[PDB]
């Protein structure tokens, strides 16, 4: 006995517009390749190779840069340095 009010008149939802001619001829193979490449994160797993890349770029490389950047902080001064002068400060 519980039904929406008869007073309601529902029509279809049309967004309208001019249907242009199809200027692109879709290739299903390319579309599948693009879908696999775009949603790779959904299928990623930690294996030896992917883990090795993870360790090189998220751990090792930051540590190298950090060692360099904290070791050389304040080390160099170059402006107008002359012969025999030290270009290092420590």
């Amino acid at each position: 006995e519980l039904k929406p009010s008869s007073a309601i008149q529902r029509g279809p939802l049309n967004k309208g517009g001019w249907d242009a001619p199809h200027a692109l001829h879709n290739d299903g193979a390319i579309d599948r390749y693009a879908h696999w490449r775009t949603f790779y994160q959904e299928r990623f797993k930690y294996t030896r190779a992917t883990g090795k890349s993870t360790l090189i770029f998220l751990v090792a490389f930051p540590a190298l840069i950090g060692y360099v950047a904290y070791q050389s902080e304040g080390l160099f001064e170059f402006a107008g340095k002359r012969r025999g002068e030290s270009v290092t400060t420590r």
């Binding site: 599948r32 696999w36 790779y40 299928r43 990623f44 797993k45 294996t47 190779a49 992917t50």
Partner: peptide, 26 residues
Amino acid sequence: IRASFDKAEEPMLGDYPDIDPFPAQL
């Protein structure tokens, strides 16, 4: 299939064709 980097992706496909690659230039 042939190279190490194409092999490394083998766990990363599920239901995508495992294509053996050939350089288009050849």
